[PDB]
Amino acid sequence: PGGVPWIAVGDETSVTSPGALRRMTSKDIPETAIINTDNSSGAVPSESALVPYIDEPLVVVTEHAITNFTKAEMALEFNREFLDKMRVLSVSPKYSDLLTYVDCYVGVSARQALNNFQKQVPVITPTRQTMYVDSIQAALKALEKWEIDLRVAQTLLPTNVPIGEVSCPMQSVVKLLDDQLPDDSLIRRYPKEAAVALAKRNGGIQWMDVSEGTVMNEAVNAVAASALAPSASAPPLEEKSKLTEQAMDLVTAAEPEIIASLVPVPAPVFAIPPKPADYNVRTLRIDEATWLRMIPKSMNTPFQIQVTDNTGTNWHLNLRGGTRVVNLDQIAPMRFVLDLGGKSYKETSWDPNGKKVGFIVFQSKIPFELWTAASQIGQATVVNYVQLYAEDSSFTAQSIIATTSLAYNYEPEQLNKTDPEMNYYLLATFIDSAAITPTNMTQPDVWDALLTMSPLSAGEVTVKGAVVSEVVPADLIGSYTPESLNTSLPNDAARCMIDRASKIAEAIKIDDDAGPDEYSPNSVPIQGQLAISQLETGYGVRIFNPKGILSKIASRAMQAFIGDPSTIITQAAPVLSDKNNWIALAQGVKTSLRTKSLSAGVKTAVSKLSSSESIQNWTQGFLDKVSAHFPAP
């Protein structure tokens, strides 16, 4: 049943009673007290001075429990011949001898025990338990180095054949092990023990008995090894159970009820651990990356400003048309690592070497692109900076900046944006103490490098470059242009949904061994979602088609999904763009995987035996070599 035994003190209490039950202890059951535990293996100190005599509680043991603590005992008992050599655990534990039975009220809380009066409930003290588990693990610790030697013996040459059977003279095989087992092995010390230890765990390996001249099968797990056997027709039962589980282990952890939701869904339950993303800021098309800002080009204006850092060091820099900043608002607190290294940045009178670059945060009410003077920038700070080095590269007659790792990360906490009229801008540019001539340096920024972007808030997701509290996974399907997707933020909705939906794809592969252009238990749900869409009364030019074609289209379309999951959100993909196609896929994945009955696909069934029979030939191939180079009298 489970829980803890109880005793009744009310003497007139039946159910739902104030003070009916109390805990059972060792004064209630004197036997369940640690002086009456058998001193087998010498666990309890016999000398009377060291025994506590203080009461201890009682816990109920379930069936499955003893079913495992008994099983754990046999970990020792494969190696018993070796244990006796080590003079340890002479008498086996026998878990059940540690048990004890009462028929008293059983339960976790007394309210539940009050009506649970079982019979012959096994019981044990917590201290007697700890006396047991350590004993097993004690011997397991003792057998460690012996264990490795047994494995290296078995794995030196094939002791198991996947399918069928093989044969080889014994004197030949032991001799080949003589010169390859390490000298410091305990097979060297104790052969006769190892020999019977092997034969307990392999039906093939036997040992004829010199007494009566008899040889026999000795292994103990005969019932186990059957389920691991290919038949004349299909693979072993074991993995055929396993595989369909792992498919359901994925479809479960990918929680399809979310990725199918046609309703507003909060961001955190939909977000997953995102991945870093990479960009080259200069090269972007501005009309796409909606999270960028750019001071307009071609006005001739150009000026200088001075901004300090946390230390207060005053600097100088330029701003000019064409310069770009990121709009720090709603950038879903993020991280910036920019590597200027590998570019030239050399002017006719401005060498990049020696100068400094850095990040510059901004605060100014006027929108960024309307900046035209030093007055309106308002509040600004320099958060980080480095000093550059330049190196000559393969392209002869030039030099090239060495590696940089300008770091910075964004956190809304410090900024504390409460004024609904505030603006926030980040920018990487040359920085120096002295002023810069407006024409002696002519770059608009230094954003012409490699930018690696990494998220910090995994509980908040942007969509189309804009943060949002909730998302609707249904409506994302078939709404992205690959121009846009490359310019997406690393913690975008699709990013979390592309790989999450990819997680569905592995299941389909692990279940579907279908080739090109034929139906499949997971390609067919699309097919139904196609036929009915045809038959309705609608726009355009209607078209009928026989099911011979309709069936292929789904299979042709599904093969895309495993081939690339990201294509479903790509705009106007032939089949997967539509949502009704998408949903009908994400339910069959659940249902098909729940109706399989210990089966592999026809093509997987046929191939695996043939791949298996091929190996068995190679096993006799190796064994036949063992004999010729190690004969027998």
d(CA 180, CA 434) in angstroms, rounded, equals: 75
Instruction: List binders of a copy of itself among 310-329 (CB under 8 A).
Output: 329
Q: Which does 195 bind (CB under 5 to 8 A by kind): a copy of itself, ligand MYR, none?
A: ligand MYR
Selected from 258, 366, 562, 615, the binder of a copy of itself by CB under 8 A is 366
Amino acid making up residue 590? K
Amino acid making up residue 74? M
User: Is the CB of residue 327 less than 8 Å from the CB of residue 425?
Assistant: yes
Q: Which does 191 bind (CB under 5 to 8 A by kind): ligand MYR, a copy of itself, none?
A: ligand MYR
Residue 378 touches a copy of itself, criterion: CB under 8 A: no
Nearest distance from residue 376's CB to a copy of itself, in Å?
8
Q: Which two tokens stand for residue 595?
A: 């109706």
Give me the 532-561 binding string for a copy of itself, x by CB under 8 A, dash otherwise: ------------------------------
Beta strands across the sheet bearing 292-294: 292-294, 324-327, 425-431, 356-363, 379-387
Nearest distance from residue 462's CB to a copy of itself, in Å?
13
Nearest distance from residue 366's CB to a copy of itself, in Å?
6
The binding site for ligand MYR (CB under 6 A) comprises 153, 174, 177-178, 187, 191, 194-195, 198, 205
Q: Which does 330 bind (CB under 5 to 8 A by kind): ligand MYR, a copy of itself, none?
A: a copy of itself
Give me the 476-515 binding string for a copy of itself, x by CB under 8 A, dash otherwise: ----------------------------------------
Q: Which does 365 bind (CB under 5 to 8 A by kind): a copy of itself, ligand MYR, none?
A: a copy of itself
Q: Which does 174 bind (CB under 5 to 8 A by kind): ligand MYR, a copy of itself, none?
A: ligand MYR
Nearest distance from residue 174's CB to ligand MYR, in Å?
4
For residues 191 and 367, which CB has a smaller minimum distance to ligand MYR in the complex?
191
Output Rg (C-alpha) for the chain, integer angstroms: 37
Of 587, 559, 581, residue with least CA distance to 569: 581
Q: How far apart are the first and last CA of the chain?
A: 63
Write the DSSP symbol of residue 475. G
Q: Which does 19 bind (CB under 5 to 8 A by kind): a copy of itself, ligand MYR, none?
A: none
Q: Which does 171 bind (CB under 5 to 8 A by kind): a copy of itself, ligand MYR, none?
A: none
Helices (H), 44-168: 63-77, 80-86, 95-98, 110-113, 126-142, 144-155
Nearest distance from residue 212's CB to ligand MYR, in Å?
21
For residues 58 and 205, which CB has a smaller minimum distance to ligand MYR in the complex?
205
Helix (H) or strand (E) run with residue 530 in it: helix 524-535
For residues 12 and 184, which CB has a smaller minimum distance to ligand MYR in the complex?
184
User: Is the CB of residue 305 less than 8 Å from the CB of residue 374?
Assistant: yes
User: Is the CB of residue 143 less than 8 Å from the CB of residue 151?
Assistant: no
Distance of CA 248 to the CA centre of its chain: 15
Residue 365 touches a copy of itself, criterion: CB under 8 A: yes
Nearest distance from residue 224's CB to ligand MYR, in Å?
19
Give me the 326-345 binding string for a copy of itself, x by CB under 8 A, dash otherwise: ---xx---------------
Of 604, 595, 602, 589, residue with least CA distance to 249: 589
3-state helix, strand, coil in the chain (%, to 5): 35, 15, 45
For residues 283 and 416, which CB has a smaller minimum distance to a copy of itself in the complex?
416
130 burial class (0-12, 13-18, 19+ CB within 10 angstroms)?
exposed
Residue 153: which residues within 8 A CB-CB, separation 6 or more?
177, 181, 187, 194, 198
For residues 16 and 67, which CB has a smaller minimum distance to a copy of itself in the complex?
16
For residues 197 and 328, which CB has a smaller minimum distance to ligand MYR in the complex?
197
Instruction: List binders of a copy of itself among 386-445 (CB under 8 A).
Output: 420-421, 423
For residues 147 and 178, which CB has a smaller minimum distance to ligand MYR in the complex?
178
Q: Which does 205 bind (CB under 5 to 8 A by kind): a copy of itself, ligand MYR, none?
A: ligand MYR
Q: Is 416 left (phi over 0), alpha (psi -120 to 50) or beta?
A: left
For residues 74 and 466, which CB has a smaller minimum distance to a copy of itself in the complex?
466
Q: What angle do CA 279, 282, 283 make, to 5 degrees?
A: 75
For residues 470 and 564, which CB has a smaller minimum distance to a copy of itself in the complex?
470
Q: Which does 194 bind (CB under 5 to 8 A by kind): a copy of itself, ligand MYR, none?
A: ligand MYR
For residues 365 and 603, which CB has a smaller minimum distance to a copy of itself in the complex?
365
450-455 and 277-279 beta bridge pairing: antiparallel
Nearest distance from residue 206's CB to ligand MYR, in Å?
9
Query: Phi then psi for 492, rounded to 5 degrees?
Result: -85, 165
d(CA 292, CA 4) in angstroms, rounded, equals: 65
Nearest distance from residue 149's CB to ligand MYR, in Å?
10
Q: Which two tokens stand for residue 467?
A: 């943060």
The length of the chain in residues reads 633
Selected from 224, 370, 373, 435, the binder of a copy of itself by CB under 8 A is 370
DSSP string, 136-201: HHHHHHHTHHHHHHHHHHHHTS----SSS-----HHHHHHHHHTTS-TT-HHHH-HHHHHHHHHTT
399-401 and 105-107 beta bridge pairing: unpaired
Range in contact with a copy of itself (rule: CB under 8 A) among 31-39, 363-371, 428-436, 592-600: 363-371
User: Is the CB of residue 6 less than 8 Å from the CB of residue 29?
Assistant: no
Q: Which does 420 bind (CB under 5 to 8 A by kind): ligand MYR, a copy of itself, none?
A: a copy of itself
User: Is the CB of residue 6 less than 8 Å from the CB of residue 22?
Assistant: yes
Nearest distance from residue 184's CB to ligand MYR, in Å?
13
Nearest distance from residue 172's CB to ligand MYR, in Å?
11
Q: Which does 147 bind (CB under 5 to 8 A by kind): a copy of itself, ligand MYR, none?
A: none
Binding site for a copy of itself (CB under 8 A): 329-330, 365-367, 369-370, 376, 420-421, 423
